[PDB]
Amino acid sequence: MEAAHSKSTEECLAYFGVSETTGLTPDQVKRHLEKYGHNELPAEEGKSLWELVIEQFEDLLVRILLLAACISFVLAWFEEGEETITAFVEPFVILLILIANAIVGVWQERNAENAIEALKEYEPEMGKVYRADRKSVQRIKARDIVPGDIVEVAVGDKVPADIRILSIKSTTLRVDQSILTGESVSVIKHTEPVPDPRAVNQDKKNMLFSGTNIAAGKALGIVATTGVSTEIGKIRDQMAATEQDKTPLQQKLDEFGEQLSKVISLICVAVWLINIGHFNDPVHGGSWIRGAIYYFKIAVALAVAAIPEGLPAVITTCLALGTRRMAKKNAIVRSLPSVETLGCTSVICSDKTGTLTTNQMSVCKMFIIDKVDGDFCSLNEFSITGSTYAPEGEVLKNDKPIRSGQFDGLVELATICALCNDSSLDFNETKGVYEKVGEATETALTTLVEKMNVFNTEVRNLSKVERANACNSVIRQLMKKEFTLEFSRDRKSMSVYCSPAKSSRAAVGNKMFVKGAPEGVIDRCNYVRVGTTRVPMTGPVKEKILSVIKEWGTGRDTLRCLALATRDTPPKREEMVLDDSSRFMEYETDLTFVGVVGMLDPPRKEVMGSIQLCRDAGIRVIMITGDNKGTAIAICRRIGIFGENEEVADRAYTGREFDDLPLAEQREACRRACCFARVEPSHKSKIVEYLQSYDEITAMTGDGVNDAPALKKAEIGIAMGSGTAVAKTASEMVLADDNFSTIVAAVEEGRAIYNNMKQFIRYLISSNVGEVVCIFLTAALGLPEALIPVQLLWVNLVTDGLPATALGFNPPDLDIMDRPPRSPKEPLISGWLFFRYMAIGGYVGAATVGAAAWWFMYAEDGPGVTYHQLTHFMQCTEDHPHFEGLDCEIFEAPEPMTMALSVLVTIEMCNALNSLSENQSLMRMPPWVNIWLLGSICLSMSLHFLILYVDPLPMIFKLKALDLTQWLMVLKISLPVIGLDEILKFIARNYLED
Ligand SMILES: Nc1ncnc2c1ncn2[C@@H]1O[C@H](COP(=O)(O)OP(=O)(O)CP(=O)(O)O)[C@@H](O)[C@H]1O
Ligand SMILES: CC(=O)C1=C(O)N2[C@H](C1=O)[C@H]1c3c[nH]c4cccc(c34)C[C@H]1C2(C)C
Ligand SMILES: [K+]
Ligand SMILES: [Mg+2]
Ligand SMILES: [Mn+2]
Ligand SMILES: [Mn+2]
């Protein structure tokens, strides 16, 4: 059944053809269960660890290193009776890396807790119905409720389905709809049509929404919809639309996967063309068994050389450490990549209530009457400080603290606030904070009474649990509450009838204390309290008081105001009927106006300063709230999203006003406007989606179930520590201490992290370039491979491993938070920078083949000088007469490859220093800046020396140690890589773009 809110109750009943005092028949229920299905949300799984690891071995690039694992496996199985001892280390070191990178890949991408399961917390197991087969209510499984059911809800119930209210049995039905609005103040419901077809949930005052709850009262309704066709079901579906997105760089990674996987395929057929180059002269002395095996040997060496294994490890380590830093600021990152994603953020969308604000309703202004001089009427206004339910703050007069008990009118105001009240305050010993018990707007009065302390009660030595209601209890000892005239919609006030406690002295006679909406309470006042005296309420006085109250309700203030009054001479108890709320208004007449309190849900102290720092970093903040527009704008002004006098006609929209714009204008509104109010959970994700469609990297901050869709949709969702479990499980990061400042800190950390990542990725990839150049040089020319996979794997994983991780510890810049966010489209290399280490890469790729082949010809030991014969080792077994004065095995010596490896290691270690900075020469930026880079290289070097000098190590890696002349040759053939890039820095800091 659609449009339940605009149908009358008779139309809803007639739709299902049911009586309100009968309900559906059990057969009808059976048919509706068939037709509509059960009243429940589908569970959303999320793949076993099985189908996750499987997906790690799916993206193209990973297969390349699996191909070179299986080929490596075969070309190590059918190994001759020679070294089948360690031939299997290669297909295992590889096969190990692919295992390690998978387990890590899942340990960062997997979201443990499920947000749809948290949502189901709002699904009550049980609901209550009237069905035709019984007169009395029937308590059944909620999932068995169907459209058409007559349902009964009552105080404390979770609402089981979307329900048109038919009949309110209590005097009011008060509903907490925070899961759809973020707002915890009760909604007073009625049963009349809401004619607007586009009514937003905050308008549907005749509906009950599944998953909300009844703060008070009792009602009967008819179920309009169940299952996913409900408001909470819509939230569930937007969370189920699981896009499983990815960090900008993580999309660059996924991108570079496609990049490198083709580069290899092209290079492999390119090696093949130069392998097929001397295919026209193989003299068939070794058939093709040698040829088709030497070629795969090359492929495994090329694939290994191209793929920068260890990169997944250095990143994960960088991210993980980042997460450790944020944890010390009380930011719990639940997804590793997210710690960095925040750095690229250009727009931060924010819930207001409980996010920007404390979600703790606070009386911040009050007044009583000081004097009435005929027509003129002087008010005594006070402000009250403090922004939580904690009874901490003071009452101020002209910004100076005063003792509330000084003023008789405040004693009376406090008395009414304490007594005309169904709530209290409680100190939660487990959470360490004060919490309301009952309605927010009532607990605000309770908190006020505690701050006012009109009797100067000693409260400093109380435990926090006792302190919670101390000053209210002292008022209870004076006046005894005898009964309550509860709130009704017709009069918009409530009152309590009180007698002075035994042993009076206070004052003789019974009293009625009244609070309510200003206009109706004031209309029923014939007198005004001035101190302890009472004077006639006149027109001009009534007008002055109403005017000030109206200013308080619409200002830069926009406060909820209550008027407080007492009936000085109440009827005798016996003259009042309590079972009929229609009579209550009349009982609350001939009142004496006492005062007014104005409350709001106020900003967290750090929010204003945080918005400013965001603004200084080129980040826009947009408030997106379920709350009304007036309040939303007023808070925006207090927190500096808008200027205090800024005109916001086209900068602030309700969800409806936003919906009314042409689709094009809706997109532009999202760039111009900074406050969206009276919004549904869908509006928030819609706005985030528009923002993202300008390619803005966008964040969402929230605490509520109604923020869950936007939290999921945003690149980065951020939840408040004290907010809902649903919002937390929908987020990438949680601010455990609710400190909004931490977001600003997380952006800086994320920018620092991004800078270090991009450059340690360059450092690690400049390496993989030279290797490929090498594995191609010593292949095309017909040379004995200067490096083989098992050595390359050590370098990429370990030798370059440490230094890369060292660069992820470089100091962040000083202006890091004074630049605008970087563009998401920004590559990782551009023009100058690409050819920059294609030059450095052209050097390592040559100097390695160049120092290995050096050991042949122009070196001492030194088989050696063969020249053109070196580029023809395939015919030493066959065409031996050519190779006279030499053996036919010394072409497979460990020394020349040790020369090659020692060059690579030495070049990359130097290449780590020039990686400390992008443009600043080592002259102007010392190599002693990042000490941890020094310890990192000295480790890599001492590890290099190791595999050269430990009995097993050089056999598994095919190395043989170098003389001190074999190292002088290495240094004089590697160290120039510094001066090369160093001059590449001089030709970039001046004549390029500096
Ligand atoms: N328990 C209570 N005792 C006294 N006064 C109460 C009260 N609960 C609410 N009120 C007062 O009466 C008014 C009744 O609220 P109501 O149901 O009219 O909603 P609202 O006017 O705040 C709704 P909306 O923002 O959706 O238009 C409140 O604004 C408040 O001043
Ligand atoms: C088994 C497993 O999950 C993985 C791997 O085994 N790896 C990475 C990877 O994710 C591979 C990868 C994909 N996209 C990129 C971009 C840059 C670098 C890497 C990758 C390293 C790749 C490899 C093969 C080490
Ligand atoms: K998200
Ligand atoms: Mg909220
Ligand atoms: Mn992977
Ligand atoms: Mn109302």
How far is 91 from 84, CA to CA, in rounded Å? 12
Ligand sitting nearest the alpha carbon of 444: 1
Cα–Cα–Cα angle for 113, 115, 121, rounded to 5 degrees: 105
Q: What is the DSSP string of 773-793?
A: HHHHHHHHS----S--HHHHH
CATH code of the domain containing 290: 1.20.1110.10
Q: Do residues 382 and 367 touch, judged by C-beta distance below 8 A?
A: yes
SS3 content of the chain, % helix, strand, coil (to 5): 45, 15, 40
Q: Beta strand pairing status for 620-624 and 675-677?
A: parallel
Domain region containing 643: 346-358+603-745
Show the tokens assigned to 646.
């800024």
- What angle separates helix 832-852 from helix 894-913, to the nearest 10 degrees? 150
Which residues contact residue 314 at a Cβ distance below 8 angstroms, ignoring those fewer than 6 apart?
760, 764, 801, 804, 805, 808
Q: How far is CA 142 from CA 226, 230, 485, in A?
A: 10, 14, 35
Which residues contact residue 272 at a Cβ distance below 8 angstroms, ignoring those fewer than 6 apart?
295
**724 and 641: one domain?**
yes
Nearest to 178 by CA among 681, 700, 706: 706
Ligand sitting nearest the alpha carbon of 718: 3
How far is 553 from 235, CA to CA, in rounded Å? 33
**859 and 956: one domain?**
yes
**337 and 263: one domain?**
yes
Q: Do residues 989 and 920 touch, judged by C-beta distance below 8 A?
A: yes
Is 879 assigned a catalytic role? no
**295 and 350: one domain?**
no
Could you tell me the resolution of this structure in angstroms?
A: 2.5
Residue showing tokens 């869950």:
708
Nearest to 186 by CA among 560, 446, 702: 560
Show the tokens assigned to 687.
């706005």
How far is 899 from 902, CA to CA, in rounded Å? 5
- What angle separates helix 60-77 from helix 90-109, to the nearest 10 degrees? 150
Number of domains observed in the structure of the chain: 4
Q: What is the DSSP string of 726-744?
A: HHHHT-SEEETT--THHHH
Does any ligand 2 atom lie closer than 6 A to the CB of residue 59? Answer: yes
Mutate to test the pocket of ligand 1, among 183, 188, 200 (most ligand atoms within 8 A of CB): 188
Show the tokens assigned to 614.
């965001």
Residue showing tokens 């101190």:
531
Name the β-bridge partners of 720: 735
**268 and 401: one domain?**
no
Q: What is the DSSP string of 30-80?
A: HHHHHHH--SSPPP-----HHHHHHHHTTSHHHHHHHHHHHHHHHHHHS--
Backbone angles phi, psi at 547, to 5 degrees: -65, -40
Element (DSSP H or E) covering residue 751: helix 741-780
How far is 595 from 414, CA to CA, in rounded Å? 10
Domain boundary among 574, 602, 630: 602
Show the tokens assigned to 139.
């308590």
Q: Do residues 433 and 467 touch, judged by C-beta distance below 8 A?
A: no
Structural domain contains residue 3: no
Its sign, for the CA torsion 875, 876, 880, 883, is: positive
Radius of gyration of the chain (CA): 38
**785 and 647: one domain?**
no
Active-site choice (149, 162, 176, 351):
351
CATH code of the domain containing 590: 3.40.1110.10
Ligand sitting nearest the alpha carbon of 720: 4
Residue type (1 letter), 46:
G
How far is 717 from 732, CA to CA, in rounded Å? 5
Structural domain contains residue 91: yes
**740 and 772: one domain?**
no
Residue showing tokens 């960062």:
108
Element (DSSP H or E) covering residue 591: strand 591-600
Q: What is the DSSP string of 80-113?
A: -SSS-SSTTSHHHHHHHHHHHHHHHHHHHH---S
**260 and 196: one domain?**
no
Domain boundary among 602, 620, 648: 602
Name the β-bridge partners of 426: 435
Q: Is 182 left (phi over 0), alpha (psi -120 to 50) or beta?
A: left
Nearest to 746 by CA among 339, 250, 317, 316: 339
Q: Long-range contacts: 245-250, Cβ < 8 Å, 24+?
A: 245/715, 246/337, 247/337, 247/338, 247/340, 247/341, 248/341, 248/344, 248/697, 248/824, 249/337, 249/340, 249/754, 249/757, 249/758, 250/337
* Strands across the sheet containing 218-225: 138-141, 126-130, 150-154, 218-225, 162-168, 207-208
Q: Do residues 626 and 381 touch, judged by C-beta distance below 8 A?
A: no
- Please return the burial class of 681, using the count of CB atoms within 10 Å of its CB with bins 0-12, 13-18 and 19+: buried
Which residues contact residue 517 at a Cβ distance below 8 angstroms, ignoring those fewer than 6 apart?
492, 493, 562, 563
How far is 341 from 347, CA to CA, in rounded Å? 12
How far is 186 from 441, CA to CA, in rounded Å? 9
Ligand 6 centroid, distance to 327 Cα (angstroms): 44
Please, what is the end-to-end C-alpha distance for the chain in angstroms? 67
Ligand 3 centroid, distance to 38 Cα (angstroms): 30
Cα–Cα–Cα angle for 49, 55, 61, rounded to 5 degrees: 145
Structural domain contains residue 814: yes
**504 and 523: one domain?**
yes
Domain boundary among 706, 723, 745: 745
Name the β-bridge partners of 499: 480
How far is 224 from 238, CA to CA, in rounded Å? 21
Nearest to 346 by CA among 821, 747, 700, 824: 821
Residue showing tokens 């649903």:
726
- Please return the burial class of 571, using the count of CB atoms within 10 Å of its CB with bins 0-12, 13-18 and 19+: middle
Structural domain contains residue 155: yes
Q: CB within 6 Å of ligand 1 — which residues?
A: 188, 202, 487, 492-494, 515-517, 562, 628
Nearest to 911 by CA among 981, 851, 993: 981
Q: What is the DSSP string of 384-400?
A: E--SSSSS---EEETTE
How far is 826 from 822, CA to CA, in rounded Å? 7
**522 and 626: one domain?**
no
Indicate which atom in ligand 1 lies nearest the CA of residue 187.
Answer: 17
Structure obtained using: X-ray
Does any ligand 2 atom lie closer than 6 A to the CB of residue 307? Answer: yes
Name the β-bridge partners of 365: 383, 598
Name the 3-class secondary structure at 577.
coil
Residue type (1 letter), 609:
G
Show the tokens assigned to 2.
């659609």
**557 and 607: one domain?**
no
Mutate to test the pocket of ligand 1, among 171, 194, 492, 629 (most ligand atoms within 8 A of CB): 492
- What angle separates helix 311-327 from helix 90-109, to the nearest 10 degrees? 30
Structural domain contains residue 167: yes
Structural domain contains residue 837: yes
How far is 854 from 864, CA to CA, in rounded Å? 9
Does any ligand 2 atom lie closer than 6 A to the CB of residue 62? Answer: yes
Among protein residues, the one whose CA lies closest to atom 6 of ligand 2: 98
Mutate to test the pocket of ligand 2, among 54, 59, 61, 67 (most ligand atoms within 8 A of CB): 61
How far is 258 from 252, CA to CA, in rounded Å? 10
Ligand 6 centroid, distance to 176 Cα (angstroms): 15
Structural domain contains residue 43: yes
Name the 3-class secondary structure at 746.
helix
Q: How far is CA 489 from CA 416, 444, 869, in A?
A: 21, 21, 104
Q: Do residues 101 and 309 touch, judged by C-beta distance below 8 A?
A: yes
Among protein residues, the one whose CA lies closest to atom 16 of ligand 1: 188
How far is 807 from 942, CA to CA, in rounded Å? 19
Q: Do residues 522 and 594 touch, judged by C-beta distance below 8 A?
A: no
How far is 553 from 563, CA to CA, in rounded Å? 12
Show the tokens assigned to 549.
């109250």
Neighbours of 923 (CB within 10 A): 9
How far is 863 from 710, CA to CA, in rounded Å? 71
CATH code of the domain containing 220: 2.70.150.10
Q: What is the DSSP string of 870-913?
A: TT--TTSSSSGGGS-SS-SSGGG-HHHHHHHHHHHHHHHHHHHH
Structural domain contains residue 4: no
**387 and 509: one domain?**
yes
